[PDB]
Amino acid sequence: GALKRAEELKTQANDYFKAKDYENAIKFYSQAIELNPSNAIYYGNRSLAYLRTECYGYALGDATRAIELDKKYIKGYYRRAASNMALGKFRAALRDYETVVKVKPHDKDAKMKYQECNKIVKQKAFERAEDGKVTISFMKELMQWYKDQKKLHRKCAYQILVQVKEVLSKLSTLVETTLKETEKITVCGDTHGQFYDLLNIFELNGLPSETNPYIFNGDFVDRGSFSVEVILTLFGFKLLYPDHFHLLRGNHETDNMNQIYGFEGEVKAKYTAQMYELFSEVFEWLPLAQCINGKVLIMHGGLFSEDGVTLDDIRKIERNRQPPDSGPMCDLLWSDPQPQNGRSISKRGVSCQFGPDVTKAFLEENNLDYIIRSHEVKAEGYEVAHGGRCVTVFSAPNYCDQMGNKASYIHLQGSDLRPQFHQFTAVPH
Template sequence: MCPFKGGMSSSRDVDNSDGLVSAGGVTDNEGRQHCRDEPKISGGRLKSITDYIPRCRRGYLTKKEIENYMTTLLRIVRRGSKICEELDIQCIVEILHRGAELFWTEPMLIELPFPDDGLIVVGDLHGYMIDLLLTMVECGSPTQRHYIFLGDYVDRGSHQIETFLFVLLMKLRWPDRVYMLRGNHETFELNANYQFFAACKRAFGSEDVYHVFGRLFDMMPVAAIFGDYFLCLHGGVSQWMTSRDNIRNLHRPTFMNQMKMLQCCLLADILWADPDLKQKSAFMPSERNTSYTFNAEGLECVLKALNVHTLLRGHQPFLRGYYENVPRKCYTVHTAPCSRDPLFAGAAFLCRREGNSYTVTARSHQVQPDWILVEKSMQAEKMLVDAFASEYLFASTEKDNCDHCAIRIPRTLTRKPRILSHLEIAEWVQTYAKQLVLDDDKYKSLAGKIGLVAKRYVLYFPVYYDILHLNGGTFRVWFSDEEKKLINTYYDDDVFNANVRYSIASSNTNLDISPRDVDVNATPYHKEPLILHMESAPSADMPVHECVEKMTISDSSKKQLFNR
């Protein structure tokens, strides 16, 4: 029997009745996180920010308006003019509100048959319009191929606003042929202190539009599955992906204080996780201060649980713009070169099905001089004019009023954490798993070593959570022999099914998921994997460009946690 029944295990990770208990930490009566570095945004105008944002003229955009906006954006980047000179704030708000409305109709996990005309997978763009146009001119318009964008549209480049709006307008024009996923840069935690906030303020003279972008980011899907074969997302897989329902049921908007603890963990992994084939354990805490890295074993466990075969991801820049992380199982693509040095390249994937096999072709492009942007924008505009006349019809519901204009943006919007950091995980362990920590003699040797204690908290959090919330078993797709031994110190050994490596007993109650065997919308895992070809794949030892981003956690925040 678990010694914590009626005590530790009664501590829940769900919100209380007034919504003030965060999944990841202690909050005050405004839902504000302690022990967390916050975006450096002024709060003076946020109380009535809706009053400063122009209202939409109506609740829809016509096909002609969307097409004109797309050609206008191409003209802006071609001429080097300012976006505010061609599109006023009301135009931007109307585009963003229609995008948020469309994203709201899509599930968090998009599940589609594999398209007959192929799939273009676009990785991180980071505000480089030239790399988007190079990809489109090379691979064709959305009327010729389906497109999936893996996130990270903003920050860094000189056309951050234009790049995101252009992709969003493609989505609005061809909603069934263009799909957009959220990246880790589409969160306040990163883009508020990075460059996108400054870009919005510089372009429009105020921060108002930035908050409308943020509201849309919170509505975006985070993963897609094509043909029950390819899993597409920005960061990586998660040890809590025991079912597709885990992803389907992620809460929107993605505020931590409205999500369950394991949902927060899952979202952090989807947006931030990286593969690390050198680590021995299937899942380990990431050096990015959030999420967990995974090796080939961890990847395979998740692919089987989700009934898919191959992961296509972004998030990490490589010298040639793409990389084969795990042969036939995991590929990374970064469409904007990680440096504007001519030695580096960007890439996109062209995925096709040929009979019983899939091919993934990397379409690489080198860094181009600035004048190429003029040429490619003209080529892209000509291609789009032809696409506008195609047989793919535009469908829009005409409404007199915009529902999103009625939504007030609260003063605390920018202070609502979206991504669970290791600091919140350590705080959870110290708050709810204190007895488990006291039972572990290893912590005694780490007395006074705050960094090492925090790392151990994050490392053992998954099994601590299992012990406190399950009567033996795990919410995860994998656990180590050491973790099983630890669980068995509190529960009988026979609670585990000897024929199954993992258990998700009771997880449908605590995580709002359904067990894998009743996931009726998932087809069986391919027992005989289809053949996957990677044309022009780089060698396994190809070096990655060192550009590791981390969530910022200050030393003062760490000390505040451990001094409580």
């Protein structure tokens, strides 16, 4: 039937590797696999063409299928550990490396790479070895403090968490803020514990106040070494300006991911274990989305898989609980757009992807102009999709000190709700 369309894309896709044509090699690899997703040889050949383009995350899973279909495929077995090492995490690469001597005899160069992999886990192991109300003087002092390292006093942090939880618990799931004709507002994307970039944001765009309202689209922690400082400063900002500072819940404000992506470890290193428990308690009360002028609706995740989805349904959401595996809040913290029409399985493994038709239907049914959603890293710091109906804004320049991408924040005006992107850069810490 279709067995002939297997080797015809072998001499073509693999030939582009000789001509350094990794792009067309990947494009043609997405064709033989498309019409023959049962050959481990092609699943292995795709790994080299996709790994040389500094894309390790998808290659990590691509190299696994070349092993499941053929456990004697050392060619596709080495590259899984190579991608794991490129990511930098231990265990998986080391386990893959040590699961090669049980299938081969005492061959040359077989154990040298295993020893070399061992020689870094040892390094990792050695690495293991005023009146409680917040004031302008207090915010400036804490800002300078965090700029000069140093942790805040435990009592002050506990009071900040208690007050911010009390303030946030009185807000609805869908916060409705009315913006006047004048008096613009600032929307920022993911922060991810980049305090020295938040410093640049506040210096370039001005400190938050009643005249310069601010709102951040989640992801204030994880994947950064200054998550605690970022989130504590943002909580102080919320306390000082409850009606001009808005925090939206994000996918990185969840315990299942705080415990894996450094925030729990950072809190336990800088403070006690219950102190992260109070972080979790105050995190569950964060709003999931915010609507401006009944026209611009912003959220950290985006649209849902369900077709109905109304603003009243958004308001009737129990925030104070862990995100479900699926449903409204899961997509409210995990969805992504798709250039083609219709829904699809999300690349992250949870929630789904929404097409331009989904965005148009949602905007028409909810009487909204466009939607803003970050959830993602963008090269230019912002992205326009779905014909302008989908806006992505990123406020985390040089995400993990490796991406080296610009960042941006959106100015929104009451007279003209058109997004005004303003870009900033690395600003090394």
